[PDB]
Each structure stands twice: as structure tokens, then as C-alpha cells.
């Protein structure tokens with residue numbers, strides 16, 4: 357269907373959905389002419405790295421005599437641009453065959469994606485209409501745990517409830533009671549901020565203001581929000597949002613030089629390069645945020661270094677990647693002899709792999725379900741009368757059934773199992789934004805951890821000695837509505 | 845719809861609705877009445893006839909999504925490569 361994709365033929369096809377662009381153009385349609393299309397604007401290198409992770413995992417599986425002998429995996433990977441419409445077009449392309457069959461061409465056995473929660477919901481409706489398994493890597497909303505609506509959804513990322521409980525614990529740990537809240541008006545910010553509100557109500561914490569912001573917000577809403585922020589006495593603000601939806605507000609705040617505010621970040625924008633820029637430090641320095649657990653993929657960087665726009669005939673996204681990396685045309689003209697290590701872009705300038713490891717784990721979980729089908733002993737199956745599933749002709753519902761009961765080993769030696777709701781628990785790390793002494797950029801220094809496996813009250817660990825407040829200070833700030841009443 | 849849980853030990857089948865709602869039938873009859881009245885009226889849209897195609901949702905996303913997939917067949921096949929519905933009423 358959609359062009360610019362990355363495709364490769366095989367016996368079994370796996371679909372993909374990755375954000376290669378942050379968003380779409382701001383063109384408005386007055387319906388005077390026939391609506392044509394919307395073009396995407398800002399290239400996202402991190403999404404390209406996630407796509408490369410998926411391709412690398414598939415190629416590794418295709419070269420293993422151990423896993424899936426005599427079977428070759430193909431793929432059809434599209435771009436979503438963090439928008440529902442493009443992902444819906446790609447999903448229609450995916451379910452072409454099943455839709456033609458039911459209502460009255462390649463067949464995909466499973467789909468990997470997507471990043472956003474609204475996009476994932478819109479995709480999951482259509483995919484559960486046909487019982488096609490869908491394993492996401494970055495959707496952490498709690499509404500996707502409802503199995504009476506989403507029947508074939510699984511995720512390799514933890515749920516967002518423990519994160520809100522952890523922010524409540526962090527606020528209680530420093531002995532604050534006067535805070536404010538900001539969330540994104542989507543399926544990711546509202547439930548998390550509601551859970552945080554409940555937890556804060558439990559622990560005797562007063563919330564002054566609560567605002568909803570969006571990437572598609574006009575000047576008036578931003579002015580009102582910044583007036584609300586200026587207009588109060590609280591210095592601690594909890595934000596449940598992502599970088600694209602948070603950029604306008606941060607730009608306006610850095611315009612007005614609003615300083616002295618302590619920010620707590622959710623995992624979405626705790627490492628966002630759209631927010632972690634030098635020109636915002638005096639506003640955003642000293643932020644305390646969450647992060648997932650890093651993983652190791654041996655030989656992945658070497659694969660990342662081998663991109664060349666001419667050799668890769670199975671990846672149509674590499675041309676724009678090269679043009680954006682080296683600023684030429686393949687207004688100078690590209691030669692193809694440049695080196696990726698030269699320019700500093702998020703493609704290979706990374707410290708830990710957190711979402712790429714999720715993509716790797718999702719691909720390997722699908723492969724292990726396929727292997728479990730391929731090794732079914734006679735009369736010892738998970739189907740009626742102990743029957744097995746023919747590996748020569750497989751179907752999406754059998755793969756989903758094997759995914760619901762899966763238990764395999766990682767390369768690092770850990771057990772990966774989905775619960776009854778298709779979720780996977782994990783630890784959290786707590787980081788603080790500092791400034792590089794030499795480079796001058798924002799550095800993410802770990803200050804603690806949150807252990808979801810412990811018991812309540814012993815799940816948090818923080819070193820205050822490593823924490824710089826507002827980026828420079830060593831004294832803990834003061835966020836209380838009123839001063840303490842003493843003896844007498 | 846019914847509460848039959850899917851064990852996925854056999855090929856999944858379609859789900860069945862349970863209770864009957866007369867208020868929704870009255871709303872459907874209201875739509876049919878409006879269309880017939882418009883057709884009978886000569887001043888409004890002369891020399892043309894208004895048709896319709898109405899389905900059941902059963903307060904479930906899946907049934908309405910199946911009906912909507914039926915609604916956009918021609919546009920879908922045109923974009924990815926039966927009379928078309930100009931407008932939809934619901935849900």
C-alpha cells in the first residue's frame with residue numbers, strides 16, 4: 357500500500373509501525389478542492405533506530421539453525437508519523453486479505469507497534485476485529501489492559517500505574533504537599549494523572565491546579581496555562597506528557613523566563629531530545645524523571661553503521677535518512693561516500709537501549725511462539741483434543757493462542773511471560789538532568805531506582821547527595837502552602 | 845452481546861447479541877419515516893430518490909466496525925490500490 361515502506365519477502369510476514377516523523381503538516385482544508393494528502397515534517401532518528409532493531413532481530417532469526425529451521429521471515433514496515441490516519445491506512449493494507457474474505461495479497465501473522473496509545477487503540481480495534489496478534493513496544497496506557505475490548509493486544513513495556521505511585525512516593529519522600537499537575541489530552545496523560553491524583557489524595561497532598569495541554573494548541577490556551585503556572589505559589593509540577601505535546605508550553609515558558617520550578621517527568625519525555633536542549637536548561641534544569649531498564653544487543657551498533665542508500669534495496673526509508681544526515685540530494689548533491697560517525701545525530705549517539713530492546717523482545721517473542729508451534733509433539737497440543745497447529749499453514753489466532761501461553765529465555769538469562777492481560781512488569785530507574793562540564797549539553801545522571809517487586813513502602817531508593825536542584829543547588833526546595841505552626 | 849469467552853482452541857466464530865431493544869427500533873423507524881417523507885415531498889430534492897442501508901451495532905465496537913468496513917469498501921479499495929454511502933447516521 358503506502359510508499360516509502362521497508363519490505364522483504366518470506367514464508368511468514370510480520371508487520372511493523374514506527375514513527376519516522378514527529379508529526380504532520382499544519383495545512384488546513386477548507387474543502388474547496390478535493391482533499392489530497394498530508395505530508396510529514398520532522399525526521400525522527402530514534403524511530404529509524406527502532407526500525408533497524410526490528411530488521412536486525414528478523415535477520416538474526418533467519419540465520420539461526422536453532423530457531424525456526426526451514427522457515428524464512430519477511431516483513432512489511434510502514435510509517436505512522438504519530439497520527440491515527442496513516443497507521444489506519446497501514447492497518448487496512450495489513451488486513452486486506454482477511455477483510456476481503458470476511459466482507460464478501462500477502463498475509464501478515466502479527467504486527468509490531470505502535471508507539472502512541474491512541475494510535476495503538478485505533479490499530480487494536482481493527483486488528484482484534486480479525487484476531488491478529490499485536491505486540492507493542494512503547495504503549496503504556498492502562499486502558500489497553502481491558503481484554504473485553506482489546507482481544508489480541510500484548511506489550512513488552514510495563515503499565516503506567518506503578519509510575520504514578522512512584523511519583524506520589526517521591527513527592528512524599530521530600531515532604532511536599534503543594535504541587536501542580538499538567539497532562540496531555542490523550543489516552544496517555546489523563547489516566548496517569550488521575551491515578552496520581554488518587555494517590556496524592558491518599559497521602560494528604562494538596563493539588564493547586566490541573567491543566568490539559570496538546571501539541572495542537574493555540575496561543576490562547578498556552579497563555580492561560582502559563583498564567584496559571586505564574587499565578588500560584590507551588591513550585592513542584594508533575595507532568596504526564598510527551599515531548600511533541602509539551603514543546604509549545606516549554607517554548608513559551610523559556611520565552612517568559614519562568615524559573616525556580618521543580619519538574620517531575622514521566623518516562624515519555626524524561627529523555628526527549630526535543631526538551632533536553634541547552635537553550636532551556638535555566639528553565640528545565642534539575643528535572644527528576646523516570647526511565648526503563650537498559651538491555652544489551654550484541655552486534656547491533658555494527659549493523660547500525662552499515663547503512664548506505666544504494667545497497668539497502670529492502671529499506672526505502674534510508675534515502676531520506678541519508679539526505680537528512682548529510683544535508684544533500686541523492687543544496688549539494690550526495691555522493692554516498694560520507695561517514696555516519698561524522699555527524700552527531702540520535703541515530704548512533706546513544707547511551708542505553710530501552711525501547712529498541714522492547715522491539716527486539718517483541719520480535720523474539722513472536723518467533724518463540726512460532727517455534728513452540730513448530731515443535732508440537734503429536735497429541736500434545738494447546739487445541740481441541742490436544743491437536744497441534746500445522747506449521748506449514750499457520751493462522752493468526754493460533755499464534756495468538758501460543759502467545760497467551762509463552763515462557764522463554766532471554767539472551768541475558770531472564771524469563772519473559774505475559775500475564776492474563778498481556779502485560780509485562782519491570783523495574784524503574786530515577787535520573788536527574790545535569791549539565792556537561794565540557795560539552796555543555798544535558799546529561800542524564802541516575803540518582804535512584806524504583807523496585808516494583810518489593811512491598812509497599814520499600815519500593816523507592818534515592819540518593820539526595822547526587823541531586824542538583826534547578827541544575828546547580830544542593831539545598832532541597834520548599835513547596836508547602838503555609839509555614840509550620842510551632843509550640844504555643 | 846453474549847459473554848462466551850474465547851479459549852482459542854478452535855477457530856474463533858462470530859459473537860451473538862442477547863437482549864432486544866425497542867427504543868432503537870423506534871429510532872430506526874424514525875430514520876425510515878424521515879427518508880420516506882423526504883422522498884414523497886416534491887419541493888425537497890426533486891427528481892431524486894434517497895436510499896438507505898442500516899445495520900445493527902449491539903452497543904459493541906466490533907459490529908459497528910464491520911458495518912463501517914462495509915460502508916467504505918469502494919473508497920478503501922481505491923485508496924489501498926457496491927454503491928457508495930454519502931452520509932452515515934449514528935452511533
Ligand SMILES: *[C@@H]1O[C@H](CO)[C@@H](O[C@@H]2O[C@H](CO)[C@@H](O)[C@H](O)[C@H]2NC(C)=O)[C@H](O)[C@H]1NC(C)=O
Nearest residue numbers: 528531532533559560561834835836838839840
Ligand atoms: C510541609 O508540610 C508537610 C505536611 O504536608 C510536612 O511533613 C510533615 O513533617 C513532619 C516532620 O518531619 C512529620 O512528622 C509529618 O508526618 C509530616 N506530614 C506529612 C508527611 O504529611 C513538612 O514537614 C512541611 N515542610 C516544611 C518545610 O514546612
Ligand SMILES: *[C@@H]1O[C@H](CO)[C@@H](O[C@@H]2O[C@H](CO)[C@@H](O)[C@H](O)[C@H]2NC(C)=O)[C@H](O)[C@H]1NC(C)=O
Nearest residue numbers: 649770781782783784805806807808809810817
Ligand atoms: C529490580 O530491582 C531490585 C532492587 O534493586 C533488584 O534486586 C536486586 O537483585 C540483585 C541480583 O539480581 C541483588 O544483587 C540486589 O541486592 C537486589 N537489590 C535489592 C534486593 O534491593 C532486581 O534484581 C531488579 N530486577 C528484577 C527483575 O527484579
Ligand SMILES: O=C(O)[C@@H]1Cc2c([nH]c3ccccc23)CN1
Nearest residue numbers: 472473494495496497544623624
Ligand atoms: O503511551 C504512550 O503514549 C507513551 C509513548 C512513549 C513512551 N515512552 C516513549 C519514548 C519515546 C517516545 C514516545 C514514548 C511511553 N508510552
Ligand SMILES: *[C@@H]1O[C@H](CO)[C@@H](O)[C@H](O)[C@H]1NC(C)=O
Nearest residue numbers: 579580581582583584585587
Ligand atoms: C492571575 O491573577 C491575576 C491577579 O489579578 C489576574 O489578573 C489574572 O486573571 C489571573 N490569571 C489566572 C489564569 O487566574
Ligand SMILES: *[C@@H]1O[C@H](CO)[C@@H](O)[C@H](O)[C@H]1NC(C)=O
Nearest residue numbers: 610611612613614615638639
Ligand atoms: C532570564 O533569567 C536568567 C536567570 O536569572 C538570567 O540570567 C537572564 O538574564 C534572564 N534573561 C532575561 C531576558 O530576562
Ligand SMILES: *[C@@H]1O[C@H](CO)[C@@H](O)[C@H](O)[C@H]1NC(C)=O
Nearest residue numbers: 762763764765771772773774
Ligand atoms: C517459566 O519457566 C520457568 C522454568 O525455566 C519457571 O520457573 C517459571 O515459573 C515459568 N513461568 C511461570 C509464569 O510459571
Ligand SMILES: [Ca+2]
Nearest residue numbers: 417420423424
Ligand atoms: Ca531460522
Ligand SMILES: [Ca+2]
Nearest residue numbers: 436470471472
Ligand atoms: Ca506509532
Ligand SMILES: [Ca+2]
Nearest residue numbers: 599627628629
Ligand atoms: Ca523523543
Ligand SMILES: [Ca+2]
Nearest residue numbers: 882885888889
Ligand atoms: Ca424529493
